[PDB]
Design a protein around this ligand. Structure first.
Ligand SMILES: *P(=O)(OC(C)C)OC(C)C
Ligand SMILES: *P(=O)(OC(C)C)OC(C)C
Ligand SMILES: *P(=O)(OC(C)C)OC(C)C
Lengths: 392, 392, 392
């Protein structure tokens, strides 16, 4: 006879964890919150900013259990980070919902380990959608809530009444770190993408259309004589880019994506930066007051990720990423006074093996690194040659 | 199958705006929130304190549109301020509800542009009613809510579930400007009055009964042997005042107004200061343990408003207000080292015309001021004479 | 047609008060909130920390009435404090609910006089249960809510929708004293006990089992090869203690109390420290992976309470408590440079009478103290003798 959530919580809370962290760059200790995604695999998620540069990470459950977890992919652009659990047993995944069919007035609840306070749930509603702009350079399309959030809730969950996930508590706004009743979370849908990506590549393959633009406000719609106070304005398409080929002109405006009306440029950015190269999609334009529908596909780009620190833990130096197919790891760029290179390391090299163990990708690598060889045998190859590098 | 507000929001949010301000007294920029009242006229409202001394004010909509607005009446006593929109097209007014039939336990939602965050809605309930006292001298009878409010929400809305208005987010309590979960808003009813007033006069015509008093607490009820721990105590009626004539004695207590029980004096004040001269009303007393019912009518007073700055924008000097019927604007009081007077201005004068354009009231005036004559031709009249004053 | 709480509030709010305080240790003034427990007796409650060292305490009602109240028992260990009202007339008690059958997801509302703001109600849900640890030494098993709470709400109420009590707003977490959306309250059940105790003894009779232990986390369950990530670990039973007799071994873990599963040690502590000596109860163990059920009974201990200040108001010196049956008050321990002793006071003494008025317990005492004799006639007895001490 008393409306409550506890009923559903019983069912959902389990699918959430309190994350405890140790790392270095000086030694540090932190904490956040994570969410089970695949019950069997033990796939938890979290704000990258909670796990960034993490040496040891342990996960604690709703029911007291402590597990050890490992990095599986970071994307500090949108601040997500998939991690996995060592020996996942008897877990509880979570159902996801469609962040897209959200409405402003719906209610939401957020759980997390704020201030190391164990499973802490709070309540609120959708304050507003598609908010962005804190760190303009990041892919942000936050949902905004009045639910109560703080240090700890980071990577925590935020669900509809049905105990279905819709976004992740990322950051809040607050002078003097304290909840004013304004929290932000990353829409489920976005996360799903960034997720299933790393799930299969240990990293993010960023698709771009190859365009420039800026927020269409009212003044602009005036100057450029169109009907639309919100939207994405096409500054200047790129040549030989998806956009180019697609047939889009500088001075056009986009009103929708895959049927989904577009609040503003910021979102559009985050929306697609989210998606994986080759991802097909359909757009609604409006050049010269005339509506347009066009199809497209994300192409390559020229991005940056995974460093010689995010895998070596200490061995600064060149950036590193996969190569061709499962053809090993390529050293992007060795610095100057960097220890990696002070091991014989030089850009362009192409690690193919180690400790009599073939390497096809960062996975097989950090995997050998896990065995923690006291002595480290690199089987790389400069130019047409074959050599080895060493370590301790 | 999921209870939500979004349904109604769809319908209401539109009737709300984000207010952006530029003024001077040194140049400044601010922001607040406003609410459409008359869909056709383009009548928005806001805390006076958000628009006070405003040079240029633009209004942005729920749907991206930007409009220009103009002052139409300020009442910094209760801090409301009606403004209108230049070229109102396709607008959305809002339905008002009866702030009087409110109850403490009802739910409420507040929207506004806090921190310039675009349409931001938050949720809560009626924390309590008839709260007052922040600035004792103001007419305050706030409703109090735990809904989330901040800089920006000022002039924002606060509605029952039905999307009917009940009060305006004015101020919150907070050390270190931040929402602790205590917000205040001015009851609809109050606002309605202050509103439809300016609607027809560009100003406020304050009625008074002509009495003095103070909060009847428990101790007092003791000393003066009555049964009532809350109420308004009649210190000393005034002679030839409504109260006088009505027949009220010093040492009486008021328990109700127009049937509406009275929490305390503070409210009673705000309640009536709210109302326009001549407004009829009925009261419930209690002199010598004996209940009383009496009728009355607000009379004149001796108040202050609309300055030579609120209309001149820069030209300090005498205060100014209407005169008799549509008989022009009267200079209340020229200071000493004030530029207005350093134009030939002197108290008692009675501007009757300007630029071959008759003037009957502040409206017709600020209206000519809008045409922004480079050179300003005043057709005033000292004593029985007729003269002109000038400007640039 | 609009869901609300006001309906029930109408009925409940009355059962709550705004507490105003004057005391010394330098003169001070404070405020909190209290709750009527017994409508006829006028039994209000509050955080001890709100009333501690109180000289004069007045209570104000939901309906404006002011009453005078008196101390009736303090327990600064769990921070509750029963007080009574002088001449209780036409009061409103409150129904209590079972804090034990609570669930995390249920909604709650909290009322109180925050910042001296008169009856202020706010809303939220059960953020989480059995939280402890702020002041480890206190008996804490708080319920945690996102409802809005602040200075003033202390001793305020916190109820289920039905207007049934479930806990008392004690403290909140907050850097820069301000509600972040994290409040804590003491479960009803706990309070009931501490309550009906003082109701009949003016003090707390602490039962102990006589054991030591510490929080069973995961690591521990490893080391000691058991299945249970939460619980109370039995460090070392005491000899001739309830536990001893009961038959409990060091290295056992408790999983439940009176059927009620046990979150952690902290709770268990608060739970039982709560209860009165001789209180019977049943436990669920788990030594060597094998479940156990045992019965028990709280015994005596060696605690501390009620000082020569909490009753004398100024007369520091020895601690004081009851003795045997209604056999008067015993001086626990006189200090050195303490005024009480500088009246002829010495430990071991046994006040039996005063002003030709027999004394059997602290009650009959503070009762004579209430008559406020200008001159104070003590009828004590050192060893086998009979003497008198004096005062002014
Ligand atoms: P997150 O838990 O939440 C945001 C307000 C940042 O904070 C830490 C753990 C980075
Ligand atoms: P308002 O938006 O809200 C109150 C807390 C003052 O604040 C500014 C714009 C004056
Ligand atoms: P309480 O009203 O609430 C806690 C946050 C302490 O605070 C005072 C009266 C001690």
């Amino acid at each position: 006879q008393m409306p409550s959530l506890a009923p559903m919580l019983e069912k959902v809370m389990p699918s959430v964890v309190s994350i405890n962290v140790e790392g270095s760059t000086q030694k540090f200790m932190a904490l956040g919150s994570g969410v089970i995604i695949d019950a069997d695999k033990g796939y938890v998620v979290t704000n990258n900013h909670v796990v960034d540069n993490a040496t040891v990470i342990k996960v604690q459950l709703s029911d007291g259990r402590k597990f050890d977890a490992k990095m599986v992919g970071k994307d500090p652009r949108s601040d997500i980070a998939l991690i996995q659990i060592q020996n996942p047993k008897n877990l509880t995944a979570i159902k996801m919902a469609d962040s897209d069919a959200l409405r402003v007035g719906d209610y939401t609840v957020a759980i997390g380990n704020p201030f190391g306070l164990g499973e802490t749930v709070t309540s609120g509603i959708v304050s507003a959608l598609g908010r962005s702009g804190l760190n303009a350079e990041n892919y942000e399309n936050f949902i905004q809530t009045d639910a109560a959030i703080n240090r700890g809730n980071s990577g925590g969950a935020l669900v509809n009444l049905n105990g279905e996930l819709i976004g992740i508590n990322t950051a809040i706004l607050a002078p003097d770190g304290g909840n004013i009743g304004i929290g932000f979370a990353i829409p489920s849908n976005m996360v799903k993408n960034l997720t299933s990506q790393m799930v299969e590549y240990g990293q993010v393959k960023r698709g771009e259309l190859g365009i420039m633009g800026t927020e269409l406000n009212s003044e602009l719609a005036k100057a450029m004589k169109v009907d639309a106070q919100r939207g994405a304005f096409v500054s200047q398409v790129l040549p030989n880019s998806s956009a180019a080929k697609a047939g889009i002109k500088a001075g056009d405006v986009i009103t929708s994506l895959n049927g989904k009306p577009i609040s503003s440029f910021a979102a559009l950015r985050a929306q697609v930066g989210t998606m994986p190269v080759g991802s097909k999609l359909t757009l609604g334009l409006l050049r010269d007051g005339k509506q347009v529908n066009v199809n497209l596909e994300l192409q390559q780009s020229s991005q940056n990720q995974v460093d010689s620190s995010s895998i070596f833990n200490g061995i600064e130096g060149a950036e590193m990423s996969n190569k061709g197919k499962d053809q090993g790891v390529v050293v992007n760029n060795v610095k100057t006074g960097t220890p990696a290179a002070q091991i014989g390391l030089k850009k362009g090299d192409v690690i193919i093996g180690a400790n009599q163990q073939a390497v096809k990708n960062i996975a097989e690598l950090r995997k050998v690194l896990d065995s923690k060889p006291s002595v480290l045998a690199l089987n790389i190859q400069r130019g047409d040659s074959t050599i080895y590098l060493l370590m301790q």
